Design a protein around this ligand. Structure first.
Ligand SMILES: CC(=O)N[C@@H]1[C@@H](O)[C@H](O[C@@H]2O[C@H](CO)[C@H](O)[C@H](O[C@]3(C(=O)O)C[C@H](O)[C@@H](NC(C)=O)[C@H]([C@H](O)[C@H](O)CO)O3)[C@H]2O)[C@@H](CO)O[C@H]1O
Ligand SMILES: CC(=O)N[C@@H]1[C@@H](O)[C@H](O[C@@H]2O[C@H](CO)[C@H](O)[C@H](O[C@]3(C(=O)O)C[C@H](O)[C@@H](NC(C)=O)[C@H]([C@H](O)[C@H](O)CO)O3)[C@H]2O)[C@@H](CO)O[C@H]1O
Ligand SMILES: CC(=O)N[C@@H]1[C@@H](O)[C@H](O[C@@H]2O[C@H](CO)[C@H](O)[C@H](O[C@]3(C(=O)O)C[C@H](O)[C@@H](NC(C)=O)[C@H]([C@H](O)[C@H](O)CO)O3)[C@H]2O)[C@@H](CO)O[C@H]1O
Ligand code: NAG
Ligand code: NAG
Ligand code: NAG
Ligand code: NAG
Ligand code: NAG
Ligand code: NAG
Lengths: 317, 162, 162, 317, 162, 317
C-alpha cells in the first residue's frame, strides 16, 4: 500500500525569468508588455474635431482652411500633418506654448472686441487667403493707409476683458517686401507697435526686406499673443504695419490634443493615443511609442516580459 | 513530486495518486489548488491596475520644438524610460521567484498535512509518497483525501506491521 | 495555531499553552517574540530613514512661469510622482508579504524546536500540539518551555505507553 | 497530557495589502504616507525674513516697500502674495531666474558703483514711489535732461567688480507714454542703451506709447540684469531713457526661499515647507503638496499605505 | 549547524561531518553547494547587465547655461538621482535577504534529504545531527553521502536498539 | 554513532545590509557601486578629435585656432577649457543648442554658398584674428563700404540647399564702437539685416556703442544661425553691419561630445565619460560624477552598497 502527493505538468510550458535564473519553464504565463496597436483613433463617446487641413493656431486667426473651426468645441483634438496655421506666410512667436494651451482648452469661444477705426482702411486682403476673391484672416483686420503712400495716424485701441476667464489676444506685425512697399502701405518712417497690459509690456517694429516665396508672397506676418486676466485691459498703440485683432478667444473647458495620421474610428474606445493609432490595453507596460499620451501604460525598452501565472513545470521523465 | 510532475493530472494543480489492491487511482486536491490560484490571481489583479494619470504632449513631431528644450525633454523622457524599464524587469523577476516559491510552499503544506494526518501509521519513502503499513482500501484513501482519516483505527495493526 | 490565534496571549506574540493534571496554563515565549519584534523594527528603521536631499522651487504659484517651461516642469513632476507612487505601493505590499511570511516562519521555528526537543516521547496531533505519552507535570512543561527537557528520563515510559 | 504552540490575536486588527491579497487583517500596522500638516512656517532656529509687501526682486531695486530689505540676510526667505517688485509700473526680463537666484543667496550685500554724472539730472522721481514726497527706487537713478526737451549727452559709464563673487547688476529702460513725452524727458531722436561685459552684449531701445494705468502711470520701466564675474567690467553706453544702477548686489551665502500664506512660528522646527505650512514628519512619503520644497518625504498619489508591523490576525473562532 | 558554522569546511559550502569508530571525518556535499552557487551567480549575472542607453550633455561646466533652464535641469537630475539611489539600496537589501534565506533553504533541503534517507533507523538530536542506532562504518557513512544508503539492511537492528 | 550536517564559515566575513537588519556578517560579498576612475579619455578604437584651443562653435566660423578643424570628422568630440569660439569678440545666440547639435553631428562638411558681390568690399580683417597679417574668420566675409563713410547698397543674397540634409547657416551682425565708426564702415543711417526662409523670419539691427576690451577690441559680433531644410532657400537682405557666410556646414553622421581636462589614452576602451576621465565598469551603479555621459551605470548618492554573494557567517564558537 502507498499514497503519493504531487503536482501537475505539461509537455508545453513557457520560459520566464526570475531573480536567480534566466529562462525557467513554468506551466502558464502571461504578457505584461503591450505590443498590439489599433491603427485608428478610437474616439467612441468623445466630442472629437479633426482639424484636417486647418492648423491649430489658425483657429485663432482664421485662415480659409479654418473657416469651419473658428469656434470649435471638443474633448479630443487631432492635428494633421497637412494642417497649416497661415494662408499669408507667417508664424507665431511662442507657437508651441499656444498649441499646448489650445490642445487642452476644450475648444474656443470668440467674442467681438469692438475696435472702431477712424481715418484708415480696414479691408486689406491678399490672394494667399482666397475666400471667393482676395481675402484675409477671418478674425483679423489688415489696417493700412487710405490711398497710397499716405500717412498712418498714430492710433490707440483698448479692450477690457469683461469675463471671468483669461482672453486669448492675438495681433500681427507685417514685414513688407521693402521699405518702399512699407511706405506704399503705411507711409514713410519707422513704425512702432507697442502693446501693454497689467502684466505685459512688449513692443514690436516691422522688418521690411526681401525673403523667399512662401505661398506666393515674400512678405511675412509675425503673430503674437497674450492671455488677458479678468477685468484687465489691453492697449495697442500703433502707427502702421499692424494686423489688428477683431475677436478674442475664450477657452471653453478642458480637453486633450494629439497628433496622428490614422483615421478616426467611433467604434472602439481608448484613452491612450499616439500618432499611429490607439493603445487599447490593460497591461501595465507598453513598447509601442514612448511619446504616447493620454492614460497609458508605462513605456519600457523591452518588447516582452513574461509574468509567471503557474508553478514550475518539471517534465514527466 | 521530488523530481517529477504528473502530466495526467489535468483537472487540478495538486492531488493524490495512490494504489493499494483495487488498482491505481488519481484525483485532484481542490483546496491547495484554489489557494495557489487565488494567490496568483491576486498578483494579476495587483499588476493589471489602470493608472489614472493623464500625460499630454510637450513636444511636436510635425514642427520640431526648439533644440535646447527639445534635448532637455528627450533627456528627461529617456531617463524616465530607463527607470520604468528597470522597474518592469525587476518587478517581473521578483514576482516570478515569489510565485514559484509559493507554489512549492503550497505543495509542502499539503504533504505535511497528510504526514500529520497519518500519524505513526505510515512512513516517508522520500519521493512524496506515504508507505502505509496496513490494509487501506479505496474508502481509506478517500478518507485521507477528504481529511477524515482516523489513525486510531489502524494504529495497532500499523505499528505491529512496522 | 493551525487555524486559530490566542486572544488571551496578551503578554507576547508566541507562547506555550498546556494542560496536564494540575489544570490548564498559558505562558509566552520570549525568544521568538523578540526575534520577530527585532526584525519588524529593523524594517521600520529602514523605511523611516530621512532623505537629506533638498529641492527648491522651480515654478511659481503667485506669478505663473512661462507656459512651455511650465508644461515641461509639470510633465516632469507628474512623471516622478508616478514613479514614487509605484515605488511606494510596491514597497509596502512586498514588505507586508515578507513580514507575514517571516512571522509564520518564526512560528514554524518554535514548533520544530519543541518537536526535536521532545524526540520520540510525543506525537504531533496536527493542530500545533504535542501529545505526550507520559506524566508531565508543571515542572516538565516548564522544562520544555525553558528548553531543558531531557527525553532520556521518559523514554522507556513514553515509548512503552505509545 | 498535551502541550500546544500558538500565536496571539485580537478582535481589533487592521487591514493591509500584500503581493497576493488586498485587505488582509494583521495585528498591528503603521502609516507610511503623511497627511498631517502644521499650518505655520516652522522657523525655529533659522534666520528668517518675511518679505511681506516687498517683492523679492524689489530688494535689488528698492521700492519703498523694500526700504527695510535692501541688505537683508536670511537662511529662509518667505515670499507673500501681497508682495510687489515695483512701485512705478514695470517688470523684470528673466524675472523667475532672478527670483530663483535670490531665494538661495542667503541675502544680499549692496555696494556703491561710483557712477558720477556730468551735464544731466539724476533726481528723477514720481508719485508711484512715495517716500515723503515723490521719490524713486532707492538703488536706482532716473537720469533725464537738465531742463525740458533738452538733449541728452551720449554717456558711457563703467564699473569693475573688485570682489571675489559675481555682482548682480540691474538697470532699467524707460518706455514713456509717448514720443512727445520721451522728447520732454530725454530729447528727440531714437535713443539707444547698449550694455557690454566679458560675456554679455545685449542692447535696448525705448518703446514710447500708450498703455494701461498701473499704479496711476501709463509708462513702464523694463528692468534688466546680469551677473558680473570677478575682475570683470560692465559698460553702459546710453543717450536717454535709462534707469541707471546706483549700487550692485553681492550674494551673501546660501539659503532657501518658499512662498506661503501662513504665519511664522518660531516654536516648531521643520525642513519641509509648502504654501500651506510645514510638513513635520519622519514618514518616507507624503500626500499634502506635490510642490513641497526643502527636505521632504516623496510625494505620492495615495492618501494612505498601511505597512504591517505585526503578524496575520486569525480570529479566535 | 543550528548555531555554528564549520570553519574547517574549506572545500565546499555544505557537507557531512561524522564520527563512528574509525575516528572523525569531514567531507563536502557538491550538489547543494553547486545549487546555491548557481543561484547566487544567477543574481550576479542579472545585476551586472550593461545598460545600452546613451545619454549626452544637456548642460555645460565651462560656460554655465541659462539660469532657469539650468535649475530645471538640476532639479530633474537630482530627482532621478533620488530615484536611482532608492532603487539601488532597496534592490541590494532585498537581494541580500533573499540570498541568506535561500542559503538557509538549501541547508534545510539537504538535512531533510538525509532525514528521509535514513527512515526509522535514526533520530534527530536537535542540532543538525542524526543519531544512528546501529553500527555504521565508513562505507555506511559514505553510503549516506552519495545517496545510496538502504534503510532495510539495518531496520531490524536499528529499531531493536531504539 | 552519529552523522551531522552543516555549512561553512570564516573568521573574516563581510558586513552587508538586508530588509530586517543593518550590518549582518556574510561569508562573501561584492561591490555594486563603482568608485574607481581612470583619469584619461579612453578612446581606443574611436575616431577622436581634441578641439584643444578651438571652440566647438568656432569650427563653423573658423577663427585661426580652428583652422585645422574646419571640416573635422569624429565619433568622439572633446571640448577643452582653453577653447574659444571667437577671435574678434562676440558670442552666439542659442549657443548651447548649437553646441549640442555639433557634439552629435559626427563632424561637419563645408560647402561654398556662391555669394558674389557687386560694389562693396569683402576683405574686412582685424588684428584679433591674425593669420600672418590682420585676418578674419575663415568661413565668413566682413562686408563694408568701398572707401570710407561711403554708402552701402541695399543687397539681397539667396542660397538654395541642394542636398538631402539640413544646412547649418551662420551669419553675423557687427556692433561697432560708435555710430561714427558704424558710419565709417557702412555709412550713415540705421542699418537693417533681415533673414528669411521657409520657417524662419528673424531680423536684426546693429547696436553701436562702447563696451569692454575683449581681445583688444570694443566692438562685438553677434553670431546667428539657422538650419536649412532640403530644397529650401535662405534670403539675406542687408544694408551694412553684416558678417556674411561664405560656406555652409552639413552634418556628417552621428557622434558624442564630452568636456574634459584629462589627456587622451588610446590604450583603454570606455563608453562612460566625464570631465575627470573614463568610468570603465560593469557595475550597475556609480558614485563618481552625476553628469557622466555615454553608456554609464546609474549615478547614486551612496558610496558603497555591498551585495551578499555568500551565506550568513556564523562564527565557530
Ligand atoms: C511670382 C513672383 O515671384 N513674382 C513676384 C510677385 O508675386 C510680387 O508681387 C506679389 O505677387 C503676389 C502673387 O504672386 C500678389 O499678387 C501680391 O499682391 C497682393 C496680394 O494679393 O498678396 C495684392 C494685394 O492687393 C496687396 N494687399 C494689400 C492689403 O496691400 C498685397 C500686398 O501688397 C503684399 O502682399 C504685402 O507685402 O499684395 C504682389 O505684391 C512682386 C512684388 O515685388 O515680386 C515678384 O518677383
Ligand atoms: C488719472 C488719469 O488717467 N490721468 C492721466 C494722468 O495721470 C497722466 O499724467 C500722469 O499722472 C500721474 C498720476 O496719475 C503723475 O502725476 C504723472 O506725473 C509724474 C509722476 O509723478 O509719475 C510727475 C513727475 O514729475 C514725472 N517725473 C519725471 C522724472 O519726469 C513723471 C513722468 O513724467 C512720467 O511718470 C513718465 O512717463 O510723471 C503724470 O504724467 C496723463 C499724462 O498724459 O494722462 C492722464 O490721462
Ligand atoms: C588699447 C586701447 O584701449 N586703445 C583703444 C584702441 O584699441 C581702439 O582702436 C582699436 O584698436 C585695436 C587694437 O587694440 C585695433 O587696432 C582696431 O583697428 C582694427 C582691428 O585690427 O581690429 C583695424 C582694422 O583695419 C579694422 N577693420 C575693418 C574691417 O574696418 C578694425 C575695425 O575698424 C574695428 O575692429 C571695428 O570696430 O579695427 C582699432 O580700432 C580705439 C578706437 O576708438 O580706442 C582705444 O581706446
Ligand atoms: C494562463 O493565464 C492567463 C492569465 O492569467 C489565463 O487567462 C489563462 O486561462 C491561463 N491558462 C490556463 C491554461 O489556465
Ligand atoms: C528627440 O527625439 C525624437 C525621437 O524620439 C527626435 O525625432 C528629435 O529630433 C529629438 N530632438 C532633438 C534631437 O533635439
Ligand atoms: C502646472 O500645474 C499647476 C498645478 O500643479 C497649475 O496651477 C499650472 O497652471 C500648471 N501649468 C501650466 C498648465 O502651464
Ligand atoms: C504598532 O506599531 C507602532 C509602530 O511600529 C508602534 O508604535 C505601536 O506601539 C504598535 N502597537 C502595539 C500595540 O504594539
Ligand atoms: C547646477 O548644478 C551644478 C553642480 O552640479 C552647479 O555647478 C550649477 O551652478 C547648478 N546650476 C544652477 C545653480 O543654476
Ligand atoms: C566573492 O564573490 C566574487 C564575485 O561574485 C567572486 O569573484 C569571488 O571569487 C568570491 N570570493 C570567494 C572567496 O569565493
Amino acid at each position: 500500500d502507498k499514497i503519493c502527493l504531487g503536482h501537475h505538468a505539461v509537455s508545453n510550458g513557457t520560459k520566464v525569468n526570475t531573480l536567480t535564473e534566466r529562462g525557467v519553464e513554468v506551466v502558464n504565463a502571461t504578457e505584461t508588455v503591450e505590443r498590439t496597436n489599433i491603427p485608428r483613433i478610437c474616439s467612441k463617446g468623445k466630442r472629437t474635431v479633426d482639424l484636417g487641413q486647418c492648423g491649430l493656431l489658425g483657429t485663432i486667426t482664421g485662415p480659409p482652411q479654418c473657416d469651419q473651426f473658428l469656434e470649435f468645441s471638443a474633448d479630443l483634438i487631432i492635428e494633421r500633418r497637412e494642417g497649416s496655421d497661415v494662408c499669408y506666410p507667417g508664424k507665431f512667436v511662442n507657437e508651441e506654448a499656444l498649441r499646448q494651451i489650445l490642445r487642452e482648452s476644450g475648444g474656443i469661444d470668440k467674442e467681438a472686441m469692438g475696435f472702431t477705426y477712424s481715418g484708415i482702411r480696414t479691408n486689406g486682403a491678399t490672394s494667399s487667403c482666397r475666400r471667393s476673391g482676395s481675402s484675409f484672416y477671418a478674425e483679423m483686420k489688415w489696417l493700412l493707409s487710405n490711398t497710397d503712400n499716405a500717412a498712418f495716424p498714430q492710433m490707440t485701441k483698448s479692450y477690457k476683458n469683461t469675463r471671468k476667464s483669461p482672453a486669448l489676444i492675438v495681433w500681427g506685425i507685417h514685414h513688407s517686401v521693402s521699405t518702399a512697399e512699407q511706405t506704399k502701405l503705411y507711409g514713410s518712417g519707422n513704425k512702432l507697435v507697442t502693446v501693454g497690459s497689467s502684466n505685459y509690456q512688449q513692443s514690436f517694429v516691422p522688418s521690411p526686406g526681401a525673403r523667399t516665396q512662401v505661398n506666393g508672397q515674400s512678405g511675412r506676418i509675425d503673430f503674437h499673443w497674450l492671455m488677458l486676466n479678468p477685468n484687465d485691459t489691453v492697449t495697442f498703440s500703433f502707427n502702421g504695419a499692424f494686423i489688428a485683432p477683431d475677436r478674442a478667444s475664450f477657452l471653453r473647458g478642458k480637453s486633450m490634443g494629439i497628433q496622428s495620421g490614422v483615421q478616426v474610428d467611433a467604434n472602439c474606445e481608448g484613452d491612450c493615443y499616439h500618432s499611429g493609432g490607439t493603445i487599447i490595453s490593460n497591461l501595465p507596460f507598453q513598447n509601442i511609442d514612448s511619446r504616447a499620451v493620454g492614460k497609458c501604460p508605462r513605456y519600457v525598452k523591452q518588447r516582452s516580459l513574461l509574468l509567471a501565472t503557474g508553478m514550475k513545470n518539471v517534465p514527466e521523465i | 513530486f521530488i523530481e517529477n510532475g504528473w502530466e495526467g493530472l489535468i483537472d487540478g494543480w495538486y492531488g493524490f495518486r495512490h494504489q493499494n489492491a483495487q488498482g491505481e487511482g488519481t484525483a485532484a486536491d481542490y483546496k491547495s489548488t484554489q489557494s495557489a490560484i487565488d494567490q496568483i490571481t491576486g498578483k494579476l489583479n495587483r499588476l493589471i491596475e489602470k493608472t489614472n494619470q493623464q500625460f499630454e504632449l510637450i513636444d511636436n513631431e510635425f514642427n520640431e520644438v526648439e533644440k535646447q528644450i527639445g534635448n532637455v525633454i528627450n533627456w528627461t523622457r529617456d531617463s524616465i524610460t530607463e527607470v520604468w524599464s528597470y522597474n518592469a524587469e525587476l518587478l517581473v523577476a521578483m514576482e516570478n521567484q515569489h510565485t514559484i516559491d509559493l507554489a512549492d510552499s503550497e505543495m509542502d503544506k499539503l504533504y505535511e498535512r497528510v504526514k500529520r494526518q497519518l500519524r505513526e501509521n505510515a512512513e516517508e519513502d522520500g519521493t512524496g509518497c506515504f508507505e502505509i503499513f496496513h490494509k487501506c482500501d479505496d474508502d481509506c484513501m478517500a478518507s485521507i483525501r477528504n481529511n477524515t482519516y482516523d489513525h486510531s483505527k489502524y494504529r495497532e495493526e500499523a505499528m505491529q506491521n512496522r
